[PDB]
Structures are given as structure tokens and as C-alpha cells.
Amino acid sequence: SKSNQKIASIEQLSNNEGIISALAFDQRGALKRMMAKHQTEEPTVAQIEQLKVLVAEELTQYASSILLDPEYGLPASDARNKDCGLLLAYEKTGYDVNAKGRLPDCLVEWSAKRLKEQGANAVKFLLYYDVDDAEEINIQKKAYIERIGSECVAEDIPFFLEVLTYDDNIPDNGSVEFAKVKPRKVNEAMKLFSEPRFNVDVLKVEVPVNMKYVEGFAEGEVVYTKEEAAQHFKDQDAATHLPYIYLSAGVSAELFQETLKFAHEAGAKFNGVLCGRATWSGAVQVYIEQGEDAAREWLRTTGFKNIDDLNKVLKDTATSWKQRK
């Protein structure tokens, strides 16, 4: 029984079939790491704002919505296509490697009310979550999400909760050891944050396996057979009643496309994507080394190919956010 305004706002984030075919560019710390590979200087605010503007200007005509951060992304939000909706990120970027727990913390100048006043159709918040963590840590995380979920009810604005999994006992997310526990980490977190007390509207989540270790896709060690990986997608689908969409996690455009196909064939009725680096990552080096004009040209050719190829796959694979179990 979702409120009329929350329904209306999620319609504004979705395409004409109800698929969330969204473009993600709220990267801050992560964008700076990408830029640091191609220049010796620290990135400027102006530089970062302008790169986000280029992506919004060139690619939002092909997206149903764009996710931006309010620290650098407000000029880009003004530049978005007239039919493209807006999500704004609410968490501070990254986490303190020297503090235990990756504890969640909102941007200090912002509230759900102020994000709505900037024109957001949704508030997005990223939480790092390990279901096996100490309860002393996880209680703080549950309480924090309850606050944000309550703010978004009062402000009558959809709450998109992004969950990224981790385990302090397995510090490398990309490892074989992490790949074995990932389905559990992802699916259990979804079960928890689907509880009504968190007031989440849409979950933005990882695919439950690391595809780099799935039979057929794997160039090295194989952690799961195709049958095993497919079952992890089925378990993910059963973990929530809420609409859920996938993040790209910086894999190649082609691997992300083949992942969505695999999810669909396995029986995950995912409702779209918030796809960032798989679409636009190549623009960063071009912008730095060649300049603005060359970056625009990259976005009009390769960027366009990446998002158009993605949209074609979504048409065949994704399910309206309104579909009910």
C-alpha cells in the first residue's frame, strides 16, 4: 500500500515499461582513485563537477534516471534530460579504513527534506553490511537505517537503500574466499533490510556471486558451477518482496550485460539497474589526457554504445518494479 507520491516518484525514475534503467554517477572517492591513475595532481572540485556534467549532458537522454551526489553533482543534475528522473546520494563517500565497523554517516549539510528540495525523486543511501558482524556494530547500522527510512516516510520520497557486503575476516572482496560467502552475505542482508521497520522502497544490490569465478565465465579457478550460481540468483529473488536493482561494481560493460542475462535465465526478476562505471569508466582517462571535447566524443560513441547495449539487454531481461509475487 505505497503512498501515492512515492509511487509517482518511482514512476519518474523508471522507463515506459516500469524498468529502472538508471545511470549511476555519485562516485566521489572512487572517482578520485580512477582519476589518480592518469594525473599526478589531486583532482579539483571544478574538474569533478564538469565530468559529471559531461556524463549527464551526453547520456541522460538514454536513461530513465540518474543517481548523483550533492557534493559535486548538483550542476550535473541541472543538466539532465527533461525526461530523466533524479536520485541523490545521502551518505558520506567511502569509509575510514582506520575505524572499526564502516559505520554509516550522512553528509553533514543534508537531510531528506533538503534533498527533496533540490529536486530529488528519491533519496539513496549506501550501507556497508556484514551479517556476521558483532551485534554491537550491527545494532548501530539498523538504528541508522531506521532513521533514514522514517525521514523518507515523512518527506514522502522513495528510499533506495544500497547494500555493499564485506567481511573483516576476508579483507579482499574480490578473492576466491569471499566469492564462497558472497551469496549468503548479500541474500541475508536483503532479508533483513526488507523488514517493514526500515521503510525501504527499493534495494540496490550486488549480484550474489562473483561472476569471475562462475563456470563458463571463469578464466582461472571455478568457485561455482552454472547450476550453483543460478540457484544463488533464485535465492536472491526469494530474499525480498521489494523491487531490487543491480549495481555494476565496475565490471566491463560486456560482463555486466552477460550477468543480467544470466540473472534473468536463472529466475531473478530484477527490476532494473543503477549502472555506473560499466557505462562511463572509459571517459575518465580521455577527459584527463585528451580534454573535454574528446571526452564528449567518447561519450557519443563508446558511452552511447555501452548504455544502448545495456538498454537492449534490459528490454529482454528486466521486470517492471510494479510486478508482485
Breaks (C-N over 2.5 A) in the chain follow: none
38 binds, among Zn ion, a copy of itself, none (CB under 5 to 8 A by kind): Zn ion
Tell me the closest approach of the beta carbon of residue 287 to Zn ion, in angstroms: 11
- Nearest C-alpha neighbor of 179 from the set 101, 277, 249, 258: 249
- In this structure, are strands 159-165 and 244-247 parallel, antiparallel, or unpaired? unpaired
Cell triple for residue 317? 531481461
Locate all alpha helices (DSSP H) within the chain, ordered by sequence. 4-13, 29-36, 45-59, 74-79, 112-117, 135-154, 176-193, 226-238, 253-266, 277-289, 292-298, 304-317
| Phi, psi (degrees; rounded to nearest 5) at 48 | -65, -45
Residue 301 is classified by DSSP as I
Q: Taking CB under 8 A as the criterion, which residues in 103-132 touch a copy of itself?
A: 103, 106, 108-114
Tell me the closest approach of the beta carbon of residue 75 to a copy of itself, in angstroms: 20
Site string for a copy of itself, 139-178 (x = CB under 8 A): xx--xx-xx--xxxxxx-----------------------
88 binds, among Zn ion, a copy of itself, none (CB under 5 to 8 A by kind): none
Q: Does 69 bind a copy of itself (CB under 8 A)?
A: no
Tell me the closest approach of the beta carbon of residue 188 to a copy of itself, in angstroms: 21
| 75 three-class SS | helix
Q: Taking CB under 5 A as the criterion, which residues in 28-67 touch Zn ion?
A: 38
Cell triple for residue 181? 560467502
How many residues touch a copy of itself (CB under 8 A)? 23
Tell me the closest approach of the beta carbon of residue 135 to a copy of itself, in angstroms: 10
Who's near 300: CB < 8 A, 6+ residues apart? 58
2 binds, among a copy of itself, Zn ion, none (CB under 5 to 8 A by kind): none
| Phi, psi (degrees; rounded to nearest 5) at 288 | -70, -45
Query: Looking at beta carbons only, is 143 or 294 nearer to a copy of itself?
Result: 143
Query: Looking at beta carbons only, is 53 or 314 nearer to Zn ion?
Result: 314
Query: Looking at beta carbons only, is 159 or 280 nearer to a copy of itself?
Result: 159
Name the site residues for a copy of itself (rule: CB under 8 A).
Answer: 103, 106, 108-114, 139-140, 143-144, 146-147, 150-155, 197, 199
Name the site residues for Zn ion (rule: CB under 5 A).
Answer: 38, 247, 285
